[PDB]
């Protein structure tokens, strides 16, 4: 099922069979990218630019409209984040939970939880290191990890 559970949910999204824009879209690929770059500099992580553009006006899938992937666009325009967003958010969650635990000494379950979060951090960092996005000498030290997020 999932890495740490026995649940078997299947909630997800289904990609339509068609790979062509609808006839009512009438939006060129060139203009959208600059809107993407302004929102990226405005602060949104690549995750929610798609949902905000989808909700606000028109484009549901950026790939079919422009022929290029969203992160690829940001990388080619020099706006890619230094650290991947999923690992960034996982670190932020782990630091905030540790911050709660040192204040609440006898919060007995969160000690068990921290092992799961840190083990997933180590597995994802090992993948990123073995693929080359992060330098091979990068290490996750719990003491100063709070500075990386903010």
- For the record, the structure tokens of 14 come out as 């289904």
**Which of RNA, Mg ion, none has residue 104 at its interface (CB below 5 to 8 Å by kind)?**
RNA
26, 42, 105, 139: which one contacts RNA (CB under 7 A)?
105
DSSP H helices, the chain, are: 29-42, 46-56, 62-66, 70-76, 85-103, 108-131, 145-149
Does residue number 86 form part of the binding site for RNA (CB under 7 A)?
yes
**C-alpha span between 97 and 110 (Å, rounded):** 8
Q: Which residue has the tokens 């606000």?
A: 56
Instruction: Check: CB of residue 86 under 8 Å from CB of residue 47.
Output: no
Nearer to RNA, 10 or 150 (CB): 10
Least Cβ distance, residue 60 to RNA (angstroms): 3
Least Cβ distance, residue 147 to RNA (angstroms): 19
Instruction: Check: CB of residue 46 under 8 Å from CB of residue 86.
Output: no
Least Cβ distance, residue 143 to RNA (angstroms): 19
Does residue number 48 form part of the binding site for RNA (CB under 7 A)?
yes
39, 79, 83, 97: which one contacts RNA (CB under 7 A)?
97
DSSP annotation string for 66-98: HSS-HHHHHHHTT---SS-HHHHHHHHHHHHHH
Nearer to Mg ion, 6 or 8 (CB): 8
Name the residues that contact Mg ion, by CB under 5 A: 8
Q: Which residue has the tokens 């990890």?
A: 145
- The contact set with RNA (CB under 7 A) reads 1-16, 19, 22, 46-51, 54, 60-63, 69-72, 76, 84-86, 89-90, 93, 96-97, 100, 103-113, 115-117, 119-120, 123-124, 127, 131
């Amino acid at each position: 099922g999932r890495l740490h559970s026995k649940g078997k949910g299947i909630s997800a999204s289904a990609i339509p069979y068609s790979r062509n824009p609808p006839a009512w879209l009438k939006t060129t690929p060139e203009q959208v990218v600059e809107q993407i770059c302004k929102l990226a500099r405005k602060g949104a992580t690549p995750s929610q630019i798609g949902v905000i553009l989808r909700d606000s006006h028109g484009i549901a899938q950026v790939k079919v409209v422009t022929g290029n992937k969203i992160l690829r666009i940001l990388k080619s325009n020099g706006l890619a984040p230094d650290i991947p967003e999923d690992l960034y958010f996982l670190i932020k969650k782990a630091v905030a939970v540790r911050k709660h635990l040192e204040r609440n000494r006898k919060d007995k379950d969160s000690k068990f939880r921290l092992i799961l979060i840190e083990s997933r951090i180590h597995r994802l960092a090992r993948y990123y290191k073995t693929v080359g996005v992060l330098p091979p000498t990068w290490k996750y030290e719990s003491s100063t990890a709070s500075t990386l997020v903010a």
